Amino acid sequence: RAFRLRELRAAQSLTQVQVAALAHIRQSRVSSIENGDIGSAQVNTLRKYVSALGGELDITVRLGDETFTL
Amino acid sequence: RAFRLRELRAAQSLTQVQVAALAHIRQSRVSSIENGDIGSAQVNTLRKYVSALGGELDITVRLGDETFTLA
C-alpha cells in the first residue's frame, strides 16, 4: 500500500536531474531518498522534493485513537 | 498543531530529559520538535520521538485526486 517516491516521480515522466533542479537541492539528495530510505532525509528536504511533483506532504500522528498533523 | 506534543508529553507528565533517553536522541532535539520547528528534523529522528512517546508517525502525500503512503 506504501508507494516509495521513485515510482511516484515516474508517474509524471520526469528525471531526477529535473526534480532536483526545480526542488533546488543536490542530485546527491534525490538519489539517496529515491533509493528507498526516508530517514536520513530532512523533512524540509522531503517537503521540497514532493512540492516538485505538484503534490503536498502531510505528517499525521496516531497514538491510541488521537490524530493531528505537524 | 503547535502546542501539541508538549501537551501530549505533559499529558502523561513526562520530562523532556526522560523522552530524550526513551527514544535515545539529544534532549536539545526535543525542545526544537516540541518547540514547533520540524522542517529541520530528519524523518527517522522525528519518528523515534513519536515511537518513544507511544504513538505512530504517518506521512500521507496528496497529489491532486490521490493519496499515497511511503513509511
Numbering used by the authors:
A (entry chain B): 31 to 100
B (entry chain A): 31 to 101
What do the authors report?
In the present study, we elucidated the crystal structure of Mycobacterium tuberculosis H37Rv HigA2 (hereafter referred to as MtHigA2), which contains an HTH motif. The HigA antitoxin represses the transcription of HigBA or forms a stable HigBA complex, thereby preventing the ribonuclease activity of the HigB toxin and the associated cytotoxic events. Structural studies of MtHigA2 confirmed that it has three regions: (i) a disordered N-terminus that is liable to cleavage, (ii) an α-helix bundle containing an HTH motif for DNA binding and (iii) a β-lid for dimerization. The antitoxin MtHigA2 has two binding partners: DNA and the toxin MtHigB2.
The crystal structure of MtHigA2 was determined from three distinct crystal forms. Form I belonged to space group P212121 and was determined to 2.0 Å resolution, form II packed in space group P43212 and was determined to 3.2 Å resolution, and form III was solved in space group P3121 to 3.4 Å resolution. However, the N-terminal ∼25 residues are unstructured in all three observed crystal forms. All dimers share the β-lid as their major dimeric interface, but the position of the α-helix bundle varies. When the different dimers are aligned based on a single HTH motif from one monomer, the corresponding motif in the dimer pair shows a different relative position. The flexibility in dimerization leads to drastic changes in the locations of positively charged residues on the HTH motif, including His54, Arg56 and Arg59. To predict the physiological dimer, each form was submitted to the PISA server to calculate the strength of the dimer interface. Interestingly, all of the forms had similarly favourable dissociation energies (ΔG): −14, −15 and −17 kcal mol−1 for forms I, II and III, respectively. This suggests that the flexibility of the β-lid does not impact the formation of a stable dimer and is likely to contribute to function. The three different crystal structures in our study reveal the flexibility in dimerization mode while anchored by the β-lid.
